[PDB]
């Protein structure tokens, strides 16, 4: 299947209490493999997955240099954003960045990303053509015009179609046993009477990787998405994920309701019925 590599950065200004906190985190699909935290003692890019410890000291030196440099740039970008929006120096602000690439099963480049958010809102994003920018408001439009003039799209395109996909591919090889492992969901159904006239059917998926999954209730072959309590896919803490879907159902009509599970790990669609 398709794979992704993402780096997620968060800078938070803390006026009075020193320079901004910077935290970066790297993922292949739903597996974290590195972190960096400007507040931590180590002052290094740090491993967070077994298969990244393969990389030699030159990798950790070079990766540490690059993320430190990012941290110093986004500390200045926080100051520039203050200026562009005319904000007080008294307040805490957030600059988030995401960048990375997708590859197909063939290992070929599919999609690249390079984008920022200021105070939880879209600031600037590289569009899919990796040639042009979506700028949210008139402040981001200032950065957009500067970045058009300085050919920044061309710079990021070279990273996204080059180092990004080369890195992702090397990681998918070296960590093959982790990253190209599919763990199918372990599924069951519960029944909880509310009364003699209604019951809650809860459909469970446990211990699956990756996180991508569809849990769907049907009543006689028809989607019940408006009536289904669907919780956010959630980490178990061991590298696998958890999800449930619940419907409340007329007592005597349980057999009308089917739970449908789709996961990359399932050879075939699972249909679950209440089988007491």
């Amino acid at each position: 299947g398709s794979h992704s590599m993402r780096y997620f950065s968060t800078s938070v200004s803390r006026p009075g209490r020193g320079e901004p906190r910077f935290i970066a985190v790297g993922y292949v699909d739903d597996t974290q493999f590195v972190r960096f935290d400007s507040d931590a003692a180590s002052q290094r890019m740090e491993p967070r997955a077994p298969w990244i410890e393969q990389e030699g000291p030159e990798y950790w030196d070079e990766e540490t240099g690059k993320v430190k440099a990012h941290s110093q740039t986004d500390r200045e970008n926080l100051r520039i954003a203050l200026r562009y929006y005319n904000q007080s120096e008294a307040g805490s602000h957030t600059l988030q960045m995401m960048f990375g690439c997708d590859v197909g099963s063939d290992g070929r480049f599919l999609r690249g990303y390079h984008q920022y958010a200021y105070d939880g809102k879209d600031y600037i994003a590289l569009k899919e053509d990796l040639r042009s920018w979506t700028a949210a408001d008139m402040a981001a439009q200032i950065t957009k015009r500067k970045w058009e003039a300085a050919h920044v799209a061309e710079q990021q395109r070279a990273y996204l179609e080059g180092t990004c996909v080369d890195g992702l591919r090397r990681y998918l090889e070296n960590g093959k046993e982790t990253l190209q492992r599919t763990d199918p969901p372990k599924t069951h159904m519960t029944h909880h009477p509310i009364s003699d006239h209604e019951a809650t059917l809860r459909c469970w998926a446990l211990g699956f990787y990756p996180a991508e999954i569809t849990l769907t209730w049907q009543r006689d072959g028809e989607d019940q998405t408006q009536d289904t309590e669907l919780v956010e896919t959630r980490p178990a803490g061991d590298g696998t994920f958890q999800k449930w879907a619940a419907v409340v159902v007329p007592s005597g009509e349980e057999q009308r309701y089917t739970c449908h599970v789709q996961h990359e790990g399932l050879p075939k669609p699972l249909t679950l019925r209440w089988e007491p």
Binding site: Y7, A69, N77, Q155, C164
Partner: peptide, 9 residues
């Protein structure tokens, strides 16, 4: 692999 040469707003 991190990208490099980060750009001012």
């Amino acid at each position: 692999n991190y990208n490099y040469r980060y750009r001012l707003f």
